[PDB]
Design an enzyme around this catalytic site. Sequence first.
Site, PDB file in Angstrom:
ATOM      1  N   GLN A  99       0.811  -1.253   0.000  1.00  0.00           N
ATOM      2  CA  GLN A  99       0.000   0.000   0.000  1.00  0.00           C
ATOM      3  C   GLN A  99       0.822   1.270   0.000  1.00  0.00           C
ATOM      4  O   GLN A  99       0.496   2.247  -0.667  1.00  0.00           O
ATOM      5  CB  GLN A  99      -0.924   0.014   1.221  1.00  0.00           C
ATOM      6  N   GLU A 100       1.924   1.273   0.725  1.00  0.00           N
ATOM      7  CA  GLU A 100       2.728   2.506   0.821  1.00  0.00           C
ATOM      8  C   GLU A 100       3.470   2.782  -0.498  1.00  0.00           C
ATOM      9  O   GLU A 100       3.358   3.898  -1.050  1.00  0.00           O
ATOM     10  CB  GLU A 100       3.732   2.417   2.014  1.00  0.00           C
ATOM     11  N   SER A 101       4.206   1.791  -1.026  1.00  0.00           N
ATOM     12  CA  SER A 101       5.055   2.019  -2.225  1.00  0.00           C
ATOM     13  C   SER A 101       4.970   1.032  -3.393  1.00  0.00           C
ATOM     14  O   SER A 101       5.746   1.116  -4.363  1.00  0.00           O
ATOM     15  CB  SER A 101       6.538   2.071  -1.816  1.00  0.00           C
TER      16      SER A 101
END
Length: 418
Positions: A274-276
């Site tokens: 989700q972040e990167s």
Amino acid sequence: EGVLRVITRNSPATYFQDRNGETGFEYELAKRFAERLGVELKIETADNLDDLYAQLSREGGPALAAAGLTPGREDDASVRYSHTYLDVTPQIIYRNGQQRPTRPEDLVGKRIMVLKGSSHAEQLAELKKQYPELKYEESDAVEVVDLLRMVDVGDIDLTLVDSNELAMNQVYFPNVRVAFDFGEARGLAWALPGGDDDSLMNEVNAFLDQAKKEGLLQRLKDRYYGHVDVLGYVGAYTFAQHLQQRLPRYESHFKQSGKQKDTDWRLLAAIGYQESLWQPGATSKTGVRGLMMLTNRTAQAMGVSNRLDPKQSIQGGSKYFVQIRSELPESIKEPDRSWFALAAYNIGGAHLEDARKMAEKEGLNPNKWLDVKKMLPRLAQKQWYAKTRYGYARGGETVHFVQNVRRYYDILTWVTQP
Ligand SMILES: C[C@H](NC(=O)[C@@H](C)O)C(=O)N[C@H](CCC(=O)NC(CCCC[NH3+])C(=O)N[C@H](C)C(N)=O)C(=O)O
């Protein structure tokens, strides 16, 4: 004598608290100015627009108002406006799948809402001399984000707002649409009370002139305009896929942080996704970077000396997630505790605690994720966040973050059985 009082609106376009503290276009501009004056910045937030102008004009109130204001009359000297720092055009907004109005007359017969005390209410007041059939509603218990939501979900047909408000929020209200520009472009400005000493006003304008050019204003205009915040779910084909192409480069680091912190490595990996999307060179204009998208500050606080190093980024973001989970109230039990830890990871613990207080007062259970996740989107509604301690947060995006990380976690759990 060293304290600048600036009055503003609590709203995403101006001033608000996120997980890192204070932020917003106006907040920064006001901060880079109080720095240039060598004083402490004290933000004060007004209840509505009428009250902002009231506090500005009573003795001894705040130095200035920085709040996306459209200058009023120049031959009214009771309030004086700085040079302009951002150009906007008011826009009529309607909902997709409804009759798109094409000109000012088409607003007759629609349900219309605007902020009370606003440039935009005056525009309609004027229009209503030219068309007495026009009706529109005014409210002090909404912010521009409420209006767009109300159009998005179909609680009102039309609203009228500055275009920058639309740039900021469009992405979070898929159903809204520009019908037409309604007025000439104009520039927003800070408001100071009038008027016998020009000490302050002259300093304000020297600053706003220096900040353009020097790029400062365009810097800000770009950080905040159009920006996404929380990535959309990529679907099973793309995750597919990155499972094959990317995860094997990083799995061992997720597994080692998993052991070190006594926790499920698949949930760490889901966060990272989700972040990167598992890209160690990812960045944002918002100042996060690396595989887990750490701020400089959080990176330093977690022992991370190179945010672009995947192992370090994974180690620190994981440490951060696990500490956040450990600090939650003891009454929150697993598995809910992990879902609350994800919510705080994104929106911050303070906003999360307001949502838990809100849930309780609603007769819901503040230790249950299914209950508190119902409260979180209300933090974007003024009627509700004005009654909270930390005010506005884009809580619906927090919910989206948690749901997406749980979806990736569930898939990872599935392909890692039995
Ligand atoms: C630059 C900053 N926002 C941004 O998103 C950055 C990215 O550009 C900002 O200063 N925004 C305010 C946002 C909200 C707003 O529309 N405030 C009002 C009240 C909203 C009325 C809509 N129904 C106003 O325009 N003017 C006040 C009323 C005035 N003229 O005194 C603005 O553009 O104004």
